[PDB]
Design a protein around this ligand. Structure first.
Ligand SMILES: CC(=O)Nc1ccc(-c2csc(N)n2)cc1
Ligand SMILES: [Cl-]
Ligand SMILES: [Zn+2]
Length: 561
C-alpha cells in the first residue's frame, strides 16, 4: 500500500503543509483518502446549416462509477483469464518485437498535436528544455529502483499526469500503438489503423462466417469494471521483454497502473484497480482484455468448460487445446475497438453464456444481469464505433460499404469547438475539416454533401484544414482525387479500379433511407436552404473578407445549370 503511494503522497503534502486539513467530510468509500489541502459554437458551420437552428437535437448539443468496487472473480474465472491472456500475448508477439519508444519519437508527437493528457506553459517547451529530461531521468532512475515520486493523476472522468510520467508511460508501453499490435493483421479481431471507409467492409466479412446472430453488447463504465486480475494479465506483456525495457515496463504496471494515487477537486486517494492510464495505452489494453473476455464468453457458449467455480485438469488442457486449435478462427469472428465489440459466435448458445462475463465484472448495459443478449440478424443494423453501415450500389454496379449515423449528431458535432482564442481563420479551417470529412465518409447523405460543398465554397480555397484511424480529409488535395484513392484505388474490396470522373457518379442512399437516418430532404425549408445556398456562402465570404474562393456547388447536378 503506502510503501508505493507514500513517497508521492509525502511529496504532495510537504509542498502543501499549511492547508493539509484531513477533512472528515470527504465523500469517499472505495477511493482511499490519505488527506486534503464549455462547448463554444463554430459560427462558420452554424451560418451554413440554418435549417438546424430550430432542431433541438442539434441545438441542445452545444448547451450546458469511479466510486465503486468489483468482487474478485472465482478461481475458475481467474484460471480462464490467465490461460487466455498468456496465449493471446504470445499470438500478438509472434510477428512483433516489444521495444522502447524514444524522446526523439515523444518530441515528434509534441511537435505535431497528439493529445498527451498532460497538465513552461506549452509541452513544446518542456521537451526542448534539458531541465525536463533531468526530472524524467530522476523518476526514470527511481523506476529502475522500483520506486516513483511524481507519477500522479489529476482526475478531470479523464486522468491527466505530468509530461514526465506520460513520456515514461510512452517509453515503456507506446510500442503497442506505435508498432500496431492491435492491427487486424497482428490481432485478427483488432481494427487499429482501419478508419470508417473500412469498418463496414470488416463487419460484412465477419457476417460471411457461418454462425449465429451478430452480438454487440456494451459494458457499463468498462474502465470502472477493470479489475486487479485483468491488470496482472495485461502486465504479462513484460514476460516478452528484456533488459532495461522489461524493468521500466514492470514499474509502469506496478507503480502507476496497479497502485495508483490521484488528485481531485484536493483529496489524495489511492486505488489498486480500475483503468486509469494514458488514453492510447488505455485503448490498446482495453482491446486486449475485451478480446480475452469475448474468447472466454465464446468458450462458455461452446461448452469448453462446465463451471467458473473451478477448472478440472482435463478442462485446463481442453481450454488450452481449444485456443491452439481454433483460437485464431475465433478472434476472427470479432471486431473489437477498445471496450466496443461485435462477435459472430459459432451459434446462439453465446446469447445466454453469461456466467464468465458477469464474474469478470464486464456486466452488460441496458439488460437484466441474466437476461440473454439480443442478436442482430443483419450486419447493416449492427452498431459499432458509434456508426451503422449501408451497402450502396453505384450506377456502374460497383459496391460501396459506407459509414452512417443519425445526421443530427453529425451536424450538432460540426457546430461545436473546444477551447479559447480561436481566430475567424482558425474557426473557418475547423469548419473545413468537418466539411472534408463529410465529403469522404458521408457523401451519401444529401444534406451533408450539400453543406460540405457550401462550407468548402465559403472558406478560402488554399486555407489548410485544422483540428487542435485514417483522417484523409486533413489535406488541401482535391476531394475527388482523395475520394478515388480511398474508395477505389486503395480499397481491397473493390476489384475494378476504374476512376470516378465526377461527383455525379458517386451515389446517395435512397431518399427514404436518407430520411430514416435524419435527412431534412422534403421539408419546405430544406428546399429554401438548398435554393438560396449562394446567399449563405456569400454571407460567410463577406465576413472572412477579400480572399481566393472556389465555387464547389456546380459539382452537384441541381446547381449545374
Ligand atoms: C430533394 C428531393 O429529392 N425531394 C424529395 C421529395 C419527396 C420525397 C419523398 C416523398 S415520400 C418520401 N418518403 N420521400 C423525398 C425527397
Ligand atoms: Cl437485425
Ligand atoms: Zn444510416
Amino acid at each position: 500500500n503506502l510503501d508505493i503511494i507514500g513517497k508521492r503522497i509525502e511529496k504532495i503534502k510537504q509542498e502543501h503543509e499549511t492547508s493539509w486539513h484531513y477533512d472528515q467530510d470527504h465523500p469517499y468509500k472505495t477511493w482511499a483518502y490519505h488527506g486534503s489541502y464549455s462547448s463554444m459554437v463554430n459560427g462558420v458551420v452554424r451560418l451554413l446549416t440554418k435549417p438546424w437552428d430550430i432542431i433541438p437535437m442539434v441545438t441542445q448539443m452545444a448547451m450546458t462509477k469511479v466510486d465503486t468496487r468489483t468482487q474478485e472473480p472465482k478461481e475458475g474465472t481467474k484460471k480462464l483469464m490467465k490461460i487466455t491472456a498468456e496465449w493471446l500475448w504470445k499470438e500478438l508477439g509472434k510477428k512483433k518485437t516489444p521495444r522502447m519508444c524514444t524522446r526523439e519519437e515523444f518530441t515528434r508527437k509534441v511537435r505535431s498535436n497528439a493529445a498527451l493528457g498532460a497538465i513552461w506553459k506549452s509541452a513544446r517547451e518542456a521537451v526542448e528544455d534539458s531541465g525536463f529530461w533531468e526530472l524524467v531521468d530522476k523518476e526514470r532512475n527511481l523506476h529502475l529502483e522500483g520506486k516513483c515520486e511524481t507519477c500522479v493523476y489529476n482526475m478531470m472522468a479523464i486522468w491527466y499526469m505530468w509530461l514526465g510520467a506520460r513520456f515514461l508511460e510512452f517509453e515503456a508501453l507506446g510500442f503497442l500503438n506505435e508498432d500496431h499490435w492491435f492491427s487486424r493483421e497482428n490481432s485478427l479481431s483488432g481494427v487499429e489503423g482501419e478508419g470508417l471507409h473500412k469498418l463496414g467492409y470488416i463487419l460484412r466479412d465477419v457476417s460471411k462466417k457461418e454462425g449465429g446472430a451478430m452480438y454487440a453488447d456494451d459494458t457499463a463504465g468498462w474502465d470502472t469494471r477493470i479489475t486487479l486480475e485483468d491488470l496482472k494479465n495485461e502486465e504479462m506483456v513484460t514476460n516478452h521483454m528484456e533488459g532495461e525495457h522489461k524493468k521500466l515496463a514492470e514499474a509502469i504496471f506496478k507503480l502507476t497502473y496497479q497502485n495508483k494515487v490521484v488528485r481531485v477537486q484536493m483529496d489524495i486517494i489511492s486505488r489498486r484497480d480500475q483503468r486509469g492510464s494514458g488514453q492510447v495505452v488505455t485503448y490498446g489494453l482495453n482491446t486486449f482484455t475485451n478480446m480475452e473476455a469475448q474468447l472466454i464468453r465464446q468458450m462458455e457458449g461452446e461448452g469448453v468448460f462446465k463451471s467458473i467455480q473451478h477448472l478440472t485438469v482435463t478442462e485446463e488442457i481442453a481450454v488450452k487445446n481449444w485456443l491452439v486449435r481454433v483460437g485464431r478462427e475465433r478472434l476472427s469472428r470479432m471486431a473489437i475497438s477498445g471496450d466496443d465489440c461485435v462477435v459472430k459466435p459459432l451459434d446462439d448458445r453465446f446469447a445466454s453464456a453469461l456466467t464468465a462475463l458477469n464474474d469478470m465484472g464486464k456486466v452488460r448495459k441496458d439488460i437484466q444481469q441474466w437476461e440473454p443478449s439480443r442478436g442482430w440478424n443483419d450486419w447493416t443494423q449492427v452498431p459499432f464505433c458509434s456508426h451503422h453501415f449501408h451497402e450502396l450500389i453505384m450506377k456502374d454496379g460497383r459496391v460501396l460499404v459506407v459509414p452512417c449515423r443519425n445526421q443530427d449528431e453529425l451536424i450538432g458535432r460540426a457546430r461545436i469547438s473546444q477551447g479559447a482564442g480561436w481566430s475567424l481563420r482558425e474557426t473557418a479551417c475547423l469548419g473545413k475539416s468537418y466539411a472534408q470529412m463529410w465529403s469522404l465518409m458521408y457523401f451519401h447523405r444529401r444534406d451533408l454533401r450539400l453543406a460540405a460543398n457550401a462550407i468548402c465554397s465559403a472558406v478560402p480555397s488554399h486555407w489548410v484544414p485544422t483540428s487542435r484511424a485514417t483522417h484523409e480529409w486533413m489535406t488541401t488535395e482535391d476531394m475527388l482525387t482523395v475520394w478515388n484513392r480511398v474508395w477505389i484505388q486503395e480499397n481491397p474490396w473493390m476489384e475494378d479500379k476504374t476512376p470516378v470522373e465526377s461527383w455525379e457518379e458517386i451515389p446517395y442512399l435512397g431518399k427514404r433511407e436518407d430520411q430514416w437516418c435524419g435527412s431534412l430532404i422534403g421539408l419546405t425549408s430544406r428546399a429554401t436552404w438548398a435554393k438560396n445556398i449562394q446567399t449563405a456562402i456569400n454571407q460567410v465570404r463577406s465576413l472572412i473578407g477579400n480572399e481566393e474562393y472556389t465555387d464547389y456547388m456546380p459539382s452537384m447536378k441541381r446547381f449545374r445549370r
